[PDB]
Amino acid sequence: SVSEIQLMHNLGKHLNSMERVEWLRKKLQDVHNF
Amino acid sequence: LDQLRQEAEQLKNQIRDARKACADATLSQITNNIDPVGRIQMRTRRTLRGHLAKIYAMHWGTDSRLLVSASQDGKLIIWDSYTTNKVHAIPLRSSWVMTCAYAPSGNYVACGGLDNICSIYNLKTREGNVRVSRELAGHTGYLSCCRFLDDNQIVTSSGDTTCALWDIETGQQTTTFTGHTGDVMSLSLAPDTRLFVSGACDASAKLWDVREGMCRQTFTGHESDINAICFFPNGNAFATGSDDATCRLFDLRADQELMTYSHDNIICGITSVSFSKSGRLLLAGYDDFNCNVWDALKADRAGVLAGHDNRVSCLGVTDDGMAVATGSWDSFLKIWN
Amino acid sequence: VQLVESGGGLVQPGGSRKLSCSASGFAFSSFGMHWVRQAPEKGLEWVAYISSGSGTIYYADTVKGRFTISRDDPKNTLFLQMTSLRSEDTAMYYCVRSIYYYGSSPFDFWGQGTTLTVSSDIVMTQATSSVPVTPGESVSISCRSSKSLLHSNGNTYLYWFLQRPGQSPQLLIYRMSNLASGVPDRFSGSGSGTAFTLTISRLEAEDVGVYYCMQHLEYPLTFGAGTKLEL
Amino acid sequence: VMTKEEQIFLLHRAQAQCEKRLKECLPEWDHILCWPLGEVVAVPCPDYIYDFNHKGHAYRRCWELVPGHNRTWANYSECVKFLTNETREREVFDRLGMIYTVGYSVSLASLTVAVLILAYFRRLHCTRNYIHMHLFLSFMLRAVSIFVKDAVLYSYAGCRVAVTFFLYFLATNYYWILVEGLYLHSLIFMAFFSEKKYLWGFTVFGWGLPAVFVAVWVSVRATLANTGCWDLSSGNKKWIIQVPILASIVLNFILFINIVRVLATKLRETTRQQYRKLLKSTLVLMPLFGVHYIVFMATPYTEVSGTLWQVQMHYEMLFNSFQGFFVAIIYCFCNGEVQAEIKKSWSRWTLALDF
Amino acid sequence: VSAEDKAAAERSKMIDKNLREDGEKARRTLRLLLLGADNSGKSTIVKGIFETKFQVDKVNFHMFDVGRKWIQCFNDVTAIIFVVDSSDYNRLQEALNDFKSIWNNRWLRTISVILFLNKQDLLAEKVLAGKSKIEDYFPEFARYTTPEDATPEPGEDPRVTRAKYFIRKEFVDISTASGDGRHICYPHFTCAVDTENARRIFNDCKDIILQMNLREYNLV
Amino acid sequence: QARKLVEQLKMEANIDRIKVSKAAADLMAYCEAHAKEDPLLTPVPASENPF
Ligand SMILES: *[C@@H]1O[C@H](CO)[C@@H](O[C@@H]2O[C@H](CO)[C@@H](O)[C@H](O)[C@H]2NC(C)=O)[C@H](O)[C@H]1NC(C)=O
């Protein structure tokens, strides 16, 4: 795998899924708080 | 034979003593109170391209506008340096050409080299093409230099330790000059054309009378081969460039060396030498890929012509002194001014 | 050096004809060729021009578009294709060689022309249409130009031709100052800007004919009226 | 891709469905799960959460309260077992970003000086130095493409062009690196091979062939996966660009062995004094051939938090970005003829100072 | 410019085209300089300036024989074929001195010499006869012994092999006295009948070009 | 032969010679004579220079 192309396909996925992840962390935080 | 050797040694000692007494003073200490030149900053006003091998020889025409160039690619090129045009392209029969010359009339050009033949080419003829007119065979060694005297008289020097005068119409040697021990590497015809000087590998220069055919004078100041010789425009002196990495200016009326041109950083030999119109600037082309403008009266480098990527092989001046031409092993001829 | 020309003949108006000029005796490939005609009783008139290698071609506005000039160097021939012949295109046609490089003599050699009969510009003028002379005398023939033929390079582009009766023009002086080859040294030329003169000292026989002055600074190449010398 | 909008919509839908079920220990809503009715209640992890391990389950005690507090107790380790620390992955990405940014910066600075030297000196104008110039330019363009793609993607047709240039000027460098090895291979294994003729093919092959399968990429992305900036993998579409590059790495390695193999034979058919020479030749000749690429060329797409991923990216981002630096020094500044020209040029300038 | 000057410039352009064509045609050849002395078969190796042209493996070689200032002419030449006569021992020292002079020649510091030792058949015959002993001319020969593991022969006399290797070693260690690795002496043997000389020259020229390339790449 | 060598040496010895000071003064005087006509020493105006 061309590391430079893979790093673009990985950094994009991480920044793209960032929205869902941040939302879930806060919700999981409140579940334990409940 | 022993008596002859003793007489020769005695005569040499007498010559050395007589010429040692005539040295009342030295040109170096006679020219210590003058105005030095300064910096001879010469720019390449033209660069001639078309030669695809080392340039060995180049000679200006009488009009200071046309010049011939001979290079190892085996082609004589006539350049109109005013418009950098190629007036003619002369294909040589042999590519190991070491010298070329331009007839004073402009109708002919001479070229020679390792083939021991001085080929003459007619330029100004009907049919509009340069053609071979006469070939001068008879020299045993390689031809080092050649200069026309007129349309029918050319002096050459060969590596067989001789110089010859040729009548071109008959193509015959009218006079043979003998006495040099080493190979004769350069010859310079006098301005009057009566005499000429030649330097050889024996580290000596000899002055020759063209008509008489004898050696009028002999000079020895070098400890290495003399590769270039040029007559002072006055005609009463000359300069020799040798493998000693020095030049030396000799006179004819004194019969002994007058000046030596050397630099500590200069250890390369002198490939070529020439004089400006004034004779005040001895321009020398070395093997370190540049030319030095020596003050012939002060023997100081008042200028450098550093634009050649390889050894400078040929170095000449125009008859009007308006430009200099330098040809190097980098295959480019350059006009500087 | 020979330039033998063929063609001519009788032609109906509006037709076409092909003129040929075969060269033999020089390096044709290195020479630029020219066509010059002469009316039945008028002077000379440039027609066309082709340079060595066919790189540059020029024609005359009078015949531009209908004339074509070509050359075959391996065959050593020059061709002039004529189209839409006019009643003004009846004349004797000549082919001329001219090599161009430093110190060269253009228009060096002309040829014997061929007769054709059919059933702005720099202008130089010759005031004298006839000048009686006597053997042994010195004759000066002047011919001026519309503009200064002197150029920045220092060349005064004026050429002189002599046409003896029943003969082709022959060059005498080129670039207004340089003598040709084979011409006796009696002829000479000189002058200054726009004032051009040709001197003949010790005039002798075989020197009778029409003198034509020509310019070469820029095309078209224009001839003079023609000064005729009689005994 | 699932997003914060669809994800929130599903949660509200589940919550509304939860209320209807409740309207029909008692069940209750804990902002994620609907717990059903002295026993340890176990429920499957919510199936409508995409980032949840559906194979696990959540455990409660009947509801049991957390000792020392007034909050209900529940176990969610099983559902969150296979998550990844987002903050740490972001940190690793940032570290890699700085590694190549410094390396390509020095590589770009050095090769700019290298190209000018090979152009300003007409003495150093041969098919070898012409090939070097093309390689030195491919290195600089690849460095610039990464900067441009970085400044657009992370900061529309505007961004589809930056990605397209990045995938092209990257492929050119891997292919001009191949031309260097191919040139030296023929320069050692082909007897008096023609040099001017091959200069045409190398230039067309080095700049043109990369465009052939990059243009194929643009056509497929625009016709089947025209979404975003094309910076996200769209399945097996990435192999159209990568497979040709991975072929370049293998072939260059194959040539590198041959050259070193022959260099070993010569030093034997002329002893630590012989091993030092072979070591020196191999080391100087590695940056030109990109030998370091062979280590991880076959590495698949692995978890960003795995150990294989971490070694690969730190290793490659350091030796990929600094390859231009080494090539500029070994093959321009360490060349004998190049140094002679500088010394001759310096000497000529020194003579000018001699005025 | 004038029309005359336009035509002159056109002529100059045609001349430039012709010069470029001539150079393109003449660029591919490889040049060689032939050196030696009499009674050495110098001019009997391949079958003013006696220049000769010969082709091998689609490569053209131009060998130049002249007949030492003028050597400068052959400064950018592929190789120097320096032939020597190893049959007569009285002038063997003169040949060694000439080899030293050519090898240390300032203009030839980067030119590899394809050294040739001719009339090895005559040398072997003289060794077998025993009339003349190389020790009489080179005393060190009496204290010389052929290398044990470096004597590939078709089954020749050990005495002949020892003498040949002694002469070759003298020439080779004159070559390597100070070479700095910029040029290499390639010794060979010729008996005036071995037609495999052009192949040797071709292989050595290929090796010289290879060494130049490697030096450019710093691999050597 | 030695006879020719001694004859040539005698001929070269039996010649007129002048003091080196005057010999060099000749060249200096001629250099000054042609000093004002060499553009290679004093550059000529750009208009007059063909190059
Ligand atoms: C996830 O990783 C981050 C860092 O990448 C952790 O937070 C850091 O923890 C270190 C010590 O391990 C501290 O020095 C830093 O100050 C922390 N950063 C911040 C922004 O607070 C975090 O603890 C990790 N989480 C898990 C669950 O492992």
XYZ file of C-alpha atoms in Angstrom, chain A:
34
model
C 0.000 0.000 0.000
C 1.246 3.471 -0.935
C 1.543 4.916 2.560
C 0.843 8.461 1.375
C -2.391 7.445 -0.359
C -3.377 5.252 2.594
C -2.767 8.112 5.023
C -5.126 10.302 2.989
C -7.782 7.575 2.942
C -7.376 7.114 6.707
C -7.239 10.759 7.784
C -10.317 11.405 5.657
C -12.227 8.543 7.263
C -11.274 9.695 10.762
C -12.279 13.313 10.146
C -15.409 12.156 8.303
C -16.578 9.863 11.121
C -15.610 12.483 13.718
C -19.193 13.790 13.827
C -20.695 10.442 14.852
C -17.915 9.658 17.323
C -18.196 12.938 19.228
C -21.979 12.540 19.436
C -21.733 8.984 20.766
C -19.090 9.778 23.393
C -21.350 12.394 24.977
C -24.314 10.007 24.903
C -22.294 7.123 26.354
C -21.125 9.596 28.998
C -24.741 10.305 29.960
C -25.739 6.621 29.989
C -23.284 5.908 32.804
C -24.397 9.136 34.503
C -27.929 7.636 34.451
